[PDB]
Coordinates of C-alpha atoms and ligand atoms in Angstrom, one line a residue:
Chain A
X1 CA 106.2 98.1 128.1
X2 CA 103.8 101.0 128.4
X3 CA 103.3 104.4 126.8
X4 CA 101.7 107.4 128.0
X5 CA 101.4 110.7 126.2
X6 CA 100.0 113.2 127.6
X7 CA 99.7 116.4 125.2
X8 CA 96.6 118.5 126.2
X9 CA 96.0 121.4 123.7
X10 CA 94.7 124.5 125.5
X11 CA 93.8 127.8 122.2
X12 CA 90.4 128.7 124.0
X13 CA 89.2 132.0 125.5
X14 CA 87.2 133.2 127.6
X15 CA 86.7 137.5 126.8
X16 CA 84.1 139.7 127.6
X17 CA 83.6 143.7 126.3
X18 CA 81.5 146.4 128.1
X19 CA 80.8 149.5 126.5
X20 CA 80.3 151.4 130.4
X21 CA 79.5 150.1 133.6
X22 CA 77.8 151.6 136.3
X23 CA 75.3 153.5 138.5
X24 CA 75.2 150.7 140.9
X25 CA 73.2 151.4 143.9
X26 CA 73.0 149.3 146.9
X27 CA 71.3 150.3 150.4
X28 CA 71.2 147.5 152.9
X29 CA 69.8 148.6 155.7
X30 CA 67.9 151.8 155.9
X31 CA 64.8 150.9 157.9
X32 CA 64.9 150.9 162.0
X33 CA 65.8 148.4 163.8
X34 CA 64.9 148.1 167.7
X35 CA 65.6 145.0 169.9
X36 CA 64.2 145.4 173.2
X37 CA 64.8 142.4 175.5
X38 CA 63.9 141.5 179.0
X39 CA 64.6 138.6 181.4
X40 CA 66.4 136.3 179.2
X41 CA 68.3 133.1 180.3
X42 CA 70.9 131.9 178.1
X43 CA 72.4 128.8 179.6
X44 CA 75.5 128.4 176.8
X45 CA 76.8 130.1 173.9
X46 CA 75.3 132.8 172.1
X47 CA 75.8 134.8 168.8
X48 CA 74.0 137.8 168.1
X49 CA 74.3 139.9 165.0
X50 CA 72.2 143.3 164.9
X51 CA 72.1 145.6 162.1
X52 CA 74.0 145.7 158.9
X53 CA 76.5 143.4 159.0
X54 CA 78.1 141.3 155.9
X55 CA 76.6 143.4 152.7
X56 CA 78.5 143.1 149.6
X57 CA 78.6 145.2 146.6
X58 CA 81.5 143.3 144.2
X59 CA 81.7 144.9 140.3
X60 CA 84.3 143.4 138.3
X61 CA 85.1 144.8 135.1
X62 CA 85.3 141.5 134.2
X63 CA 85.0 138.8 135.9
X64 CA 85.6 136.3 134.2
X65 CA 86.8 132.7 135.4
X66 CA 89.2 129.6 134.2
X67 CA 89.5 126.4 135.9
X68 CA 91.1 123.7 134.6
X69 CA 92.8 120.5 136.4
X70 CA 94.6 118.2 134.9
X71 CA 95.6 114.7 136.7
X72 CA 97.7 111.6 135.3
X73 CA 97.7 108.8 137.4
X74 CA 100.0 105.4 137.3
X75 CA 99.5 102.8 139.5
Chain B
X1 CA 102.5 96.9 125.5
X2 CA 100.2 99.4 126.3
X3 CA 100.0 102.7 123.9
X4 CA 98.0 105.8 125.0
X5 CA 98.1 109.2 123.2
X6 CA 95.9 111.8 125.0
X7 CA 95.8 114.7 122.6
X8 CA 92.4 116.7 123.2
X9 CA 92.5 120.1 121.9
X10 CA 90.3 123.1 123.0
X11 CA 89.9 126.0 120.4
X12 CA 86.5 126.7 121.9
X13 CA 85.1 130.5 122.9
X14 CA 83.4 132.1 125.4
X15 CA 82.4 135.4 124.9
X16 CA 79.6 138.2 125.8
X17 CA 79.6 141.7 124.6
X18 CA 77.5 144.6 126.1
X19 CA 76.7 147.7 125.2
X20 CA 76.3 149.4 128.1
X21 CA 75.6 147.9 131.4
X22 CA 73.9 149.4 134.7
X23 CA 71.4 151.6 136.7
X24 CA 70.8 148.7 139.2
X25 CA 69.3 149.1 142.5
X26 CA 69.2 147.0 145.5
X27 CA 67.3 148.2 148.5
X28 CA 66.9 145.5 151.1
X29 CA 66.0 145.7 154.8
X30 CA 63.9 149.2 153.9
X31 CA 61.3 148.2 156.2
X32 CA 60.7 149.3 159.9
X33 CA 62.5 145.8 162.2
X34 CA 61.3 145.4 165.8
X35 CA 62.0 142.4 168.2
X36 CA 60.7 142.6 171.1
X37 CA 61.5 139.4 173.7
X38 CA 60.1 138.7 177.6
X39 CA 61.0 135.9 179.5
X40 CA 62.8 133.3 177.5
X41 CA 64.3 130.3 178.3
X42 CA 67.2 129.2 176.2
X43 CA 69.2 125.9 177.4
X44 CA 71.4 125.6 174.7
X45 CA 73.1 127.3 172.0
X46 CA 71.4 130.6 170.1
X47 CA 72.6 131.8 166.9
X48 CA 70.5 135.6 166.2
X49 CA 70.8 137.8 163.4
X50 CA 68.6 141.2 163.6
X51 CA 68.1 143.7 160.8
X52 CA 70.1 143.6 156.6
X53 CA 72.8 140.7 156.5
X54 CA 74.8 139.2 153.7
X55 CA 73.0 141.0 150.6
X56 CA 74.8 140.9 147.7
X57 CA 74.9 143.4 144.4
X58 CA 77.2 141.3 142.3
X59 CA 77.6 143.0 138.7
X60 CA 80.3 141.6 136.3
X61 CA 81.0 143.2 133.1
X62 CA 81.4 139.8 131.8
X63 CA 80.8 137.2 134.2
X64 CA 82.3 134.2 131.8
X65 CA 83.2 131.0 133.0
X66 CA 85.2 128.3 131.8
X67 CA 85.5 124.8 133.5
X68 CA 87.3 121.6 132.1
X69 CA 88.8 118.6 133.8
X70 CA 91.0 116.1 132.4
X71 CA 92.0 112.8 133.9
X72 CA 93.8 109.8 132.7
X73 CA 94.1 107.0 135.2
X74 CA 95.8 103.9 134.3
X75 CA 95.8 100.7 136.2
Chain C
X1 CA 98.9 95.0 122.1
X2 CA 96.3 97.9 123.2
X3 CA 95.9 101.3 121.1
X4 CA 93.9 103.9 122.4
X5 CA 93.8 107.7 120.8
X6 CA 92.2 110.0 122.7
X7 CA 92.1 113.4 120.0
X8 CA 88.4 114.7 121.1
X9 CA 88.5 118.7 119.0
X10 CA 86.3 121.5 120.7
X11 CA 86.1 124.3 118.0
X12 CA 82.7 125.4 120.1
X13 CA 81.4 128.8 120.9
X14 CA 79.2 130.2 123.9
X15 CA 78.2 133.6 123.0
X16 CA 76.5 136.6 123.8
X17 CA 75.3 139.9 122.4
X18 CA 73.4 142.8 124.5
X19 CA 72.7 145.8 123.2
X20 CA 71.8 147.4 126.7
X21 CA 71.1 146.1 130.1
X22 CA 70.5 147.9 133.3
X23 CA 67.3 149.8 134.9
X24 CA 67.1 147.0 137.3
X25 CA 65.3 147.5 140.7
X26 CA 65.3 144.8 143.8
X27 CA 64.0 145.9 147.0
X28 CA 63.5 142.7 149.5
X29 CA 62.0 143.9 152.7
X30 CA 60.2 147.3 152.5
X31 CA 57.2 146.1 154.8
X32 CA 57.5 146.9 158.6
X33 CA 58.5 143.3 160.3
X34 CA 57.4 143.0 164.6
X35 CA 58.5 139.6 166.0
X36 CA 57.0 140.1 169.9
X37 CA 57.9 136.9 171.7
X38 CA 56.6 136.2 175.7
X39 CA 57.2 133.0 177.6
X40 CA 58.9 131.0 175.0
X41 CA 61.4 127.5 176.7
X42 CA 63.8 126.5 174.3
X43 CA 65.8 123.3 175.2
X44 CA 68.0 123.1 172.5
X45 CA 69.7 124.8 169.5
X46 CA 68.3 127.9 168.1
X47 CA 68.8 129.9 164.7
X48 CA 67.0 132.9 164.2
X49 CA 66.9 135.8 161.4
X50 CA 64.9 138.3 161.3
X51 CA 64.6 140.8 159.0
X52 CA 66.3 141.3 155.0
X53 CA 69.0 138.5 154.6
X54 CA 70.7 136.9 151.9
X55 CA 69.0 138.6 149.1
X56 CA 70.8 138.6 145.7
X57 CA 71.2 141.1 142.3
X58 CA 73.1 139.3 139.9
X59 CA 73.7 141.1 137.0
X60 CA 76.5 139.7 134.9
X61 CA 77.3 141.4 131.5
X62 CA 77.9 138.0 129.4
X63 CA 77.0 135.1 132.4
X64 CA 78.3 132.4 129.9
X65 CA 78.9 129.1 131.4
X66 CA 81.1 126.4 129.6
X67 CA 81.7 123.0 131.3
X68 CA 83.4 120.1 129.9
X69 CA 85.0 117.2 131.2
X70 CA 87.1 114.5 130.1
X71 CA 88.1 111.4 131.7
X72 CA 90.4 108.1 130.4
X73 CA 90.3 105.4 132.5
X74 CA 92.3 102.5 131.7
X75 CA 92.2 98.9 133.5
Chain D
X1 CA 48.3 212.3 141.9
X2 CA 49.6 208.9 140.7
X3 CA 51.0 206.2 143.3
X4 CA 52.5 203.0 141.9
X5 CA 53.7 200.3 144.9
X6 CA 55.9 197.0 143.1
X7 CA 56.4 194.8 145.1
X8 CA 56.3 191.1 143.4
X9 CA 57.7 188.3 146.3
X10 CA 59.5 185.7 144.8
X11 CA 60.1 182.9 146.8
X12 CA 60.4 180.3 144.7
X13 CA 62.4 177.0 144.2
X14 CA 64.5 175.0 140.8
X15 CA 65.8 172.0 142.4
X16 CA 67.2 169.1 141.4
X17 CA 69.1 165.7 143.0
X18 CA 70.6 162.9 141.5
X19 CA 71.7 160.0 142.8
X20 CA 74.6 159.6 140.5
X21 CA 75.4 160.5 137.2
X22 CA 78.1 159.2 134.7
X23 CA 79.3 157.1 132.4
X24 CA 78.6 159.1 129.6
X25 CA 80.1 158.1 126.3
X26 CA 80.5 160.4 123.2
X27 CA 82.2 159.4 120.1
X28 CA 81.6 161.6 116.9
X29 CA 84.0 160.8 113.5
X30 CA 84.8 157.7 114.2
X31 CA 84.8 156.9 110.5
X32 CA 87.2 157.7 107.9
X33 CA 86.8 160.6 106.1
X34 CA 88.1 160.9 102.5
X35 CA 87.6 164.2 100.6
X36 CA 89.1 164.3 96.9
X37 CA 89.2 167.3 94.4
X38 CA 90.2 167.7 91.0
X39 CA 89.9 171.2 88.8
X40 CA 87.6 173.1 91.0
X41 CA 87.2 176.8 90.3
X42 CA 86.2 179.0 93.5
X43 CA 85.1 182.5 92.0
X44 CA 83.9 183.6 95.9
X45 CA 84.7 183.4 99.4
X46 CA 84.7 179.5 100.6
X47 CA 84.4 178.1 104.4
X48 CA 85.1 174.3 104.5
X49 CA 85.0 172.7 107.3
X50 CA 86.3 168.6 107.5
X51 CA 87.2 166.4 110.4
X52 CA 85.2 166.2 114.0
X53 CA 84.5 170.0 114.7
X54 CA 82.3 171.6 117.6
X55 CA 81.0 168.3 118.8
X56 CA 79.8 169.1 122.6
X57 CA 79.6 166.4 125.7
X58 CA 77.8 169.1 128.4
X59 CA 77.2 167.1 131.6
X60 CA 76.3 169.7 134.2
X61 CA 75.6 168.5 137.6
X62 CA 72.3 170.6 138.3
X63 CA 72.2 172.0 135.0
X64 CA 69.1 173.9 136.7
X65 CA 67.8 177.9 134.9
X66 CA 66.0 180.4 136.2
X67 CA 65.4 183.6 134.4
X68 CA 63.1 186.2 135.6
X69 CA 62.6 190.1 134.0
X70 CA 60.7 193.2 135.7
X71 CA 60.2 196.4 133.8
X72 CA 57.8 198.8 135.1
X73 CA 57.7 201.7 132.6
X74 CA 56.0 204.9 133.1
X75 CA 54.9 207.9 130.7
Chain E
X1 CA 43.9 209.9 141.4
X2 CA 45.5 206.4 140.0
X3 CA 46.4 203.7 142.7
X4 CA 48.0 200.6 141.4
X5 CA 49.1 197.8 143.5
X6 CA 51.6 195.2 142.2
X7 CA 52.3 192.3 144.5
X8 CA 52.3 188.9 143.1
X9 CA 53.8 186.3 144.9
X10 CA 55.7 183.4 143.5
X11 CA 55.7 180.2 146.2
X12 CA 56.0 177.9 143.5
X13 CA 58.1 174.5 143.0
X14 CA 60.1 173.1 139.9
X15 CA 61.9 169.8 141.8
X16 CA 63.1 166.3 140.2
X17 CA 64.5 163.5 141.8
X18 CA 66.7 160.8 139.4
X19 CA 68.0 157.8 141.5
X20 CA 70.5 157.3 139.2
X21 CA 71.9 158.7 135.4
X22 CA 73.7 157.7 133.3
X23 CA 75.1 154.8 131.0
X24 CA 74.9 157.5 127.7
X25 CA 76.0 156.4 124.4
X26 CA 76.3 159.1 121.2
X27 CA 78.6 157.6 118.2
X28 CA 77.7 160.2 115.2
X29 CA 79.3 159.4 112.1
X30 CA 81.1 156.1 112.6
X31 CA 80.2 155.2 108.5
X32 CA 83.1 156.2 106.4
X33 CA 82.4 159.4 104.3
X34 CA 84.5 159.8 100.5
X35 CA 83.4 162.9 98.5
X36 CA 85.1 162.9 94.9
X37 CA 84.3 165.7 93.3
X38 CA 85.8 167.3 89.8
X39 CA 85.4 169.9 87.3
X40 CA 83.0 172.0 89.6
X41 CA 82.5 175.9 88.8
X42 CA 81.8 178.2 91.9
X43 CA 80.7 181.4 90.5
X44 CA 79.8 182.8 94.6
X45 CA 80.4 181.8 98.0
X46 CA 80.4 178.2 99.1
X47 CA 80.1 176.9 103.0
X48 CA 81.1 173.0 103.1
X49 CA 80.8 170.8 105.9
X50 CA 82.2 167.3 105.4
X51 CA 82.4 164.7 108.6
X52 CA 81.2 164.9 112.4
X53 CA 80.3 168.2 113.0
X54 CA 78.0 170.1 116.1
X55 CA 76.8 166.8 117.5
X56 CA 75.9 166.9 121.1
X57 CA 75.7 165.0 124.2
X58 CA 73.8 167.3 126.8
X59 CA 73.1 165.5 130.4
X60 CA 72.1 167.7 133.1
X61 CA 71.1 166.7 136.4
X62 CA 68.3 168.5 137.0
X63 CA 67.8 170.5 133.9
X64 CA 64.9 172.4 135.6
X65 CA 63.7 175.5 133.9
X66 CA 62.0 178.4 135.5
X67 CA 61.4 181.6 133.0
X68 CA 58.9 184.4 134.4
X69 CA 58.4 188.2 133.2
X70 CA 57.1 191.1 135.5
X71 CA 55.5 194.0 133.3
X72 CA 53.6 196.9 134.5
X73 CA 53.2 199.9 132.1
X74 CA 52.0 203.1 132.7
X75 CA 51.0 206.2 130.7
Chain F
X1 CA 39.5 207.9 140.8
X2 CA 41.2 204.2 140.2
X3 CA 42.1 201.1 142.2
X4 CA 44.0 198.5 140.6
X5 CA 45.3 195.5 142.6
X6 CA 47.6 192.9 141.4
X7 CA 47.9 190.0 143.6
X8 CA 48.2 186.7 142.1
X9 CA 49.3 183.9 144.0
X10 CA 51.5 181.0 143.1
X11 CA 51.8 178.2 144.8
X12 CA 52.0 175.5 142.1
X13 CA 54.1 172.7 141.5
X14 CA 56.2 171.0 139.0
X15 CA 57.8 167.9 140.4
X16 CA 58.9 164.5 139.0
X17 CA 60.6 161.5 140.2
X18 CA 62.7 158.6 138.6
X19 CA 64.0 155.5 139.7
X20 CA 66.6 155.1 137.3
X21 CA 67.2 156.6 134.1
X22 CA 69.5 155.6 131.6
X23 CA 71.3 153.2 129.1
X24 CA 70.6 155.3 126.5
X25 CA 72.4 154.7 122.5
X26 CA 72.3 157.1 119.9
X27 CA 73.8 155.9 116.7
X28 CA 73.3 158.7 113.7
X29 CA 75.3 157.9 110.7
X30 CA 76.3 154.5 110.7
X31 CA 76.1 153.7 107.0
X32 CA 78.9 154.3 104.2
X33 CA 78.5 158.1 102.2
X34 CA 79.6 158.4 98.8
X35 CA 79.2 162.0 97.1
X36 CA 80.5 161.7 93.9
X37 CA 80.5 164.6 91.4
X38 CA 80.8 165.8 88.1
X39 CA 80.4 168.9 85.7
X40 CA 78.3 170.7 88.0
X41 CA 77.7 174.5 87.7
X42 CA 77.0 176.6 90.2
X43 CA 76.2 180.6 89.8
X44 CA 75.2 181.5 92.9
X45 CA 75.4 180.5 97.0
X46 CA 76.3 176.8 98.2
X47 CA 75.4 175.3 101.4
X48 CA 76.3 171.9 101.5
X49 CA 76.5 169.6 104.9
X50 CA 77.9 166.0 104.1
X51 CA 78.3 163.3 107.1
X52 CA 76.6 163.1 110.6
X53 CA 75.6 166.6 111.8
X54 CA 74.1 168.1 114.4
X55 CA 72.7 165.3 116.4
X56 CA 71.6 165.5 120.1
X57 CA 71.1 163.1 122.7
X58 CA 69.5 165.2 125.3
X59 CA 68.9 163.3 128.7
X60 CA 67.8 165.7 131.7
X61 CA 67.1 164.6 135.1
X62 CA 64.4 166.5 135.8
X63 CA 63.5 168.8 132.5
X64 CA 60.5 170.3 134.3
X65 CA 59.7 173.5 132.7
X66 CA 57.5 176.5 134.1
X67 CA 56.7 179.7 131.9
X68 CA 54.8 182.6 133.7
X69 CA 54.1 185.9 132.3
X70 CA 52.5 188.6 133.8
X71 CA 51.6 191.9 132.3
X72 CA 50.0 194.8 133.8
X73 CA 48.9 197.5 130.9
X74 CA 47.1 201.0 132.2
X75 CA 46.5 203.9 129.6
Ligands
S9C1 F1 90.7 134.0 156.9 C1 89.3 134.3 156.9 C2 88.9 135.0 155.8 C3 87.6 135.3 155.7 C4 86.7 135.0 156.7 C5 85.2 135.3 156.6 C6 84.7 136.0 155.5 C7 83.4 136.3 155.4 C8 82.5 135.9 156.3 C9 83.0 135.2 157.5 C10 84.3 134.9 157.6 N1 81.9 134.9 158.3 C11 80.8 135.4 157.8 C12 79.5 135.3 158.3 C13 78.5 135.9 157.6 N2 78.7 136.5 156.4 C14 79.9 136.5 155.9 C15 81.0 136.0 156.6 C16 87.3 134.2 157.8 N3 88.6 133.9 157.9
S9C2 F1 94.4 136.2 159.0 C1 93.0 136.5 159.0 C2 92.6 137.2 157.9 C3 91.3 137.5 157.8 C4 90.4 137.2 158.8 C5 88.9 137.5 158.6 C6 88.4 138.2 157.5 C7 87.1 138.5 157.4 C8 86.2 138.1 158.4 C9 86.7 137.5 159.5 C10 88.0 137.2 159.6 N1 85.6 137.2 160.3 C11 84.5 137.7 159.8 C12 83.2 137.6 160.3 C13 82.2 138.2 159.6 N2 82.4 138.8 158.4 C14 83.6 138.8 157.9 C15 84.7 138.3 158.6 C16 90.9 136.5 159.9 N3 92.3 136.2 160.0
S9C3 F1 87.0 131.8 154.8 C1 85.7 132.1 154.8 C2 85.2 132.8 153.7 C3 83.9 133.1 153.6 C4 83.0 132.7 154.6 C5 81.5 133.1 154.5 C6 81.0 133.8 153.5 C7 79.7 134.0 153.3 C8 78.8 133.6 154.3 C9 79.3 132.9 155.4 C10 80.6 132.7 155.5 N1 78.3 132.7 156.2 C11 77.1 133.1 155.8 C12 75.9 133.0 156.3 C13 74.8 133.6 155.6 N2 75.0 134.2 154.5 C14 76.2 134.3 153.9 C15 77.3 133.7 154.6 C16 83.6 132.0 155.7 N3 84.9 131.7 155.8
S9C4 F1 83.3 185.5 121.4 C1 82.9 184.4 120.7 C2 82.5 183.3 121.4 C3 82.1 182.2 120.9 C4 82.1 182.1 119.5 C5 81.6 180.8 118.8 C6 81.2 179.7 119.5 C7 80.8 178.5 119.0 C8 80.7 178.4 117.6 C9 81.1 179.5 116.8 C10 81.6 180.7 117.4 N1 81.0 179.2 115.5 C11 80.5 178.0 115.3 C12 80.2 177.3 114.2 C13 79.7 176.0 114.3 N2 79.5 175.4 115.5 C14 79.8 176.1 116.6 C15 80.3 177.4 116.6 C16 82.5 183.2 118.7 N3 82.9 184.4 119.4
S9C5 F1 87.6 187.1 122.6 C1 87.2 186.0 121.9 C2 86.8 184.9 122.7 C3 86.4 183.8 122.1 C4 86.4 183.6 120.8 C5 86.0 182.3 120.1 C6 85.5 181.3 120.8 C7 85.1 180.1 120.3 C8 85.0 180.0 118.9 C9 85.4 181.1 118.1 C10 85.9 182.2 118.7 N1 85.3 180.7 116.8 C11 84.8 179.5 116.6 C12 84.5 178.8 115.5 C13 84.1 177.5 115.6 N2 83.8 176.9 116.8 C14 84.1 177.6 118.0 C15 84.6 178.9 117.9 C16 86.8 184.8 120.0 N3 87.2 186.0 120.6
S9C6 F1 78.9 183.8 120.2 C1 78.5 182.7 119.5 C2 78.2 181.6 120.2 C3 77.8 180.5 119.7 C4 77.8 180.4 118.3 C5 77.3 179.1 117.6 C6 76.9 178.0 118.3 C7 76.5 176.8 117.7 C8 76.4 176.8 116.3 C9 76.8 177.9 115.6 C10 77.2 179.0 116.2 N1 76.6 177.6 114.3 C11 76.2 176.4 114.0 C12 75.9 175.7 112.9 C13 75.4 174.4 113.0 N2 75.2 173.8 114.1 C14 75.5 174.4 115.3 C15 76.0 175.8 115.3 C16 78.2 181.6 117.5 N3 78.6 182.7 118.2

């Protein structure tokens, strides 16, 4: 005989409170950029990236995050 | 026989509260970028990334988090 | 005959009061940045960056960070 | 004989830039306001005023003033 | 013979520069407010103000202020 | 016989710069009021102002300020 209760009780929280939110500046990228090149052998592959590539600006109002995993395991 | 009870209970908080939140700045890559390349060899694979890439400005209101596993395993 | 009770009780706070927060300023890479290259034999794999990369404003109103786990293991 | 020449040359600059401007918050009388009278005897003219009244948020853009006054006066 | 010349010239400069503005908070009167009043005798004229009255919130972007008088007077 | 020349010349400067300006909290009149009266007499002109009045939160960008008076007086 065996027995297994599994009864997990979950009441927490997870708030936040902002009273404004803003005058958010971001400027990747403003200088010059100049790539001169000259007599280059590439003998396989190549990635090049030039510029402003990939810049993130990300305001949540919140933000906030829950994980929570739960396993039972019977062998 | 085997008895388990697994009763865990969370009533637990987290919480932030701001005023006011902001006048943030981010100025990256402002400066003046040159590359300048003669005669190079390159035999095998080139990764190249030129000038502002991948900044982030990341501002949550709250920014809370919250993890919690639970595992029972019963052999 | 085995008994277990697992009844662990989180009545636990992660808090956080701000009155104000902001007038932040982050500027990675103002200064002028020359990469002059002449003669150069690579044989292998190459990863360059040059210039402002991966910087990073955080800025998180609360930035509260809870973890708990909980693990029953039963042989 | 009398001669009199104006001529004043006004070439003059108010300027003003801003990068942004907001979130702006104004909350007057928020609190409760109880006002209790009992056998009062008002011979006179009476102004009362109660509640939130003539409360001003002014957020002008510019906002920018320039006042200039010529008066030549002869006798 | 009277000769008078007026010829001043204005090249001046009133300039501002804000990167960012804002994040304003103005709570007047959020504390409760109870007047009791009773067997009072006005004999003349009474002006009350009870509550939140003529507060201001006043953000101009600039805010630039020039004020210049011209006076030439003859007799 | 009489000359008179009036030639001044401006070419002055009133200039500021700011980053960032802001998260700014004004908080007049927070606490609890309690005006209780009783058995007054009054026989002549009342001004009373009970709560939060006439508070400012002024926040210019710039708020440069030039004043410039000129006065030519001939008798
Ligand atoms: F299905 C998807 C969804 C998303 C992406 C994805 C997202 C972001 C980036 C990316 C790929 N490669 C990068 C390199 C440098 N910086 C940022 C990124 C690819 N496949
Ligand atoms: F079905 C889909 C859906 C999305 C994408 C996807 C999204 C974002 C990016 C991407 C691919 N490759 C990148 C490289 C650099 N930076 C960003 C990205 C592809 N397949
Ligand atoms: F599905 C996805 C989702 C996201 C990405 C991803 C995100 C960010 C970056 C990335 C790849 N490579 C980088 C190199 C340097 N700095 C930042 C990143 C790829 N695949
Ligand atoms: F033609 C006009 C135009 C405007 C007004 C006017 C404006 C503002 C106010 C006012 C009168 N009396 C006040 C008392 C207290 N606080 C503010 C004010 C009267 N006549
Ligand atoms: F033709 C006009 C045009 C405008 C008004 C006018 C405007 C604003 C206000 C006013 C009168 N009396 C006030 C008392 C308190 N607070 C504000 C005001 C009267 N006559
Ligand atoms: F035409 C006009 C225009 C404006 C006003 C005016 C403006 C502001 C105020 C006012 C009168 N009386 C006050 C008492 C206390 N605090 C502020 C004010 C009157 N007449």
């Amino acid at each position: 005989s065996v027995q297994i209760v599994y009864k997990p009780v979950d009441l927490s929280k997870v708030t936040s409170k902002c009273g404004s939110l803003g005058n958010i500046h971001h400027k990747p990228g403003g200088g010059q950029v100049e790539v001169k090149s000259e007599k280059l052998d590439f003998k396989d592959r190549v990635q090049s990236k030039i510029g402003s590539l990939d810049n993130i600006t990300h305001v949540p109002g919140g933000g906030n995050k829950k994980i929570e995993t739960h396993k039972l395991t019977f062998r």
